[PDB]
């Protein structure tokens, strides 16, 4: 491959193991999160990777991941970008809930459409709903690159990738092609839409992809930024099956 | 003052109270440090300060200490850059020793001039100094605005405002009067020779003024970019007492 990319999501948390969606719910790492990212950084300082470059969402963790991981690198002066185009997708009006809530005030089989299809968008988040302010009152939304009102209130898998492509086109992608190593701290969502894109993964089978969090996930692209084979997990083979069955169902 | 520009220099280490440089050595902030970089981010906090951009120097100390105050702020998605030329001085040939080393190896009235004056610039470090290769061959300094070799290998602290006079007037000035709020993180020198162009402060006076480090120092500027007033430190005025006390011998 021409060019190489490094991409990865940060250490899930607490609504994740009572399997809620945080979304764009600007929740801390915890420890855990934090040892996770610092593990990454170790794995990735031993394979001597030198960034000239990383790439976040403006959600904190996905911030505290990349800063983490430059420390253990010893490269704290890289520069670093943060953009909503990276965000995790936004879940709407089913932020908060658990399984069994979602479940009920929509119905098990349109809470399986929204969790698990490809194309199908949740109901918007409205103002009634109790994470509303807390999202759309904060100030980073104020100076994003599109409106504060032109900013989704709930997407689908496909309405993530279609909002990131740009931001892959028009910035991140020009510095690949410039030669620059990249790092990508991002989300479970956004990391799977931008995946499906660079290998071409059909609407049918991203779907059932897995992104173990806290691990490497290396690209390998060609001339036309396309990956050269599937991705490929960095690091101790074990830690990543792990990693994995975290993922799983 | 149509504009408000905050600017603050991190907690000084262990070769500062052996009264060694630590100049361009990419020291790590002590445990002091990084609990003062925390107590500035508290002491911001209290006073409701919302920063829209953040300045710093390419030594990790400078860049800790931002990201230590935007995580007490809840303002990690505030965009960070970085720049040599926010660099603490270059003490050259002078790095790495204590007073007693340079004065045995350069003359005692010789080091004074170099520690004290405004304009006298120290010899520079050449390829035999023991910290050169951590400098030099540092990849960060390979991407800087100017070619490696045009990189100064000393500095009087006039040499460091006029280093410093581009960023400010090319980067930064125009933030300023577009609005924003900004956080400079820079070094004793560097913060020194700001502070000495916008206030318009004598040769003379500018090496006798108080810097103390973790403290919040606001400059109020007009439309030409000059303060109104002198600097003022904010927060906890017992603190603050403190801190002059600990940079003042």
Redesign the interface.
Same mark, same amino acid.
């Given at each position: 491959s021409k060019y190489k990319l490094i991409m990865l999501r940060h250490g899930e948390g607490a609504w994740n193991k009572e399997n809620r969606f945080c979304s764009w719910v600007?929740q801390k790492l915890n420890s855990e999160g934090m040892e996770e990212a610092r593990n990454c950084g170790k794995q990735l300082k031993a394979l001597n990777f $030198?960034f000239?470059l990383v790439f976040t969402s @403006?959600?904190?963790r996905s911030?505290?991941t990349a %800063?983490l991981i430059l #420390?253990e690198l010893?490269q $704290? %002066?890289v520069? @670093? #970008?943060?953009s909503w185009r990276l965000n995790e997708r936004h879940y709407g009006a089913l932020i908060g809930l658990n399984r069994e809530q979602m479940a009920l005030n929509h119905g098990e089989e349109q809470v399986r459409l929204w969790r698990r299809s490809y194309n199908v968008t949740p109901p918007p988040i409205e103002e009634s709903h109790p994470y509303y302010q807390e999202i759309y009152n904060d *100030? *980073?939304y104020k @100076?994003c690159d599109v409106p504060l009102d032109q900013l989704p209130r709930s997407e689908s898998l496909k309405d993530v990738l279609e909002r990131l492509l740009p931001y892959w086109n028009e910035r991140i992608a020009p510095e690949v092609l410039r030669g620059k190593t990249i790092l990508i701290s991002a989300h479970g969502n956004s990391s799977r839409a931008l995946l499906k894109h660079l290998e071409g993964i059909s609407d049918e089978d991203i779907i059932n992809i897995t992104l173990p969090t806290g691990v490497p996930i290396l690209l390998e692209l060609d001339e036309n930024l396309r990956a050269v084979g599937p991705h490929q997990f960095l690091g101790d083979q074990e830690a990543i099956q792990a990693a994995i069955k975290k993922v799983e169902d």
């Open positions: 600007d $030198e000239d @403006v959600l904190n911030i505290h %800063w #420390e010893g $704290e %002066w520069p @670093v #970008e943060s *100030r *980073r @100076v």
